[PDB]
């Protein structure tokens, strides 16, 4: 089941989620309540508002969406590594390795005529 609430202002939906927690508390009291936000500013605002409203805080965690989805993967499927083998630096160094082999394959003619003139690896980087 899935729920969607449209919104004009935000404090009424804060009261709505507070009402949801009021009408139903988690069966396991030690269970952390996952909450997703898109900004650390919204994270701090939810922290301060919810702590002020309840007086205290109770099992509140703020992960970014990609981290949350990875946390879902690592618990739903086996053999998944804890972090990806494809990051914005890993492809950078691997392309550093793989471009000089793949020069002159009759398809990279413009790349050859641009890069092979004169360099000290800066343009390649």
């Amino acid at each position: 089941m899935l729920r969607v609430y449209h919104s004009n202002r935000l404090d009424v939906l804060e009261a709505l989620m507070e009402f949801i927690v009021e009408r139903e508390r988690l069966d396991d009291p030690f269970e952390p309540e996952m909450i997703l936000v898109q900004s650390t500013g919204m994270a701090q605002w939810l922290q301060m508002t919810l702590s002020q409203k309840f007086g205290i805080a109770a099992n509140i965690d703020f992960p970014l969406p990609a981290s949350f989805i990875w946390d879902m993967f690592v618990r739903v499927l086996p053999e998944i590594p804890k972090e990806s083998a494809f990051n914005k630096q890993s492809m950078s160094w691997k392309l550093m390795t793989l471009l000089p082999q793949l020069l002159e394959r009759e398809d990279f003619t413009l790349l050859r005529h641009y890069l092979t003139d004169d360099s000290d690896k800066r343009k390649l980087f």
Partner: protein, 70 residues
């Protein structure tokens, strides 16, 4: 249009083309006037003394497009 032109992707932009010009002209005066004998260098000294005096009369020719010499 990057590849066929030959541009880098980040450009530290500067606009003061005088200091580098004088600094490089000093090297030319250093390496093309020093080992002359005195009997030749006297006539060179007569026209203009140093690189600072030399740059004043040729600064406007260097900028922009290089002309064609008769």
């Amino acid at each position: 249009n990057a590849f066929e032109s030959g541009m880098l992707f980040e450009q530290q932009l500067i606009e003061d083309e005088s200091l580098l010009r004088y600094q490089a002209c000093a090297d030319f005066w250093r390496r093309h006037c020093y080992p002359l004998p005195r009997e030749i260098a006297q006539v060179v000294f007569e026209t203009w003394k140093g690189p600072q005096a030399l740059l004043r009369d040729i600064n406007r020719y260097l900028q922009g497009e290089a002309p064609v010499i008769k």
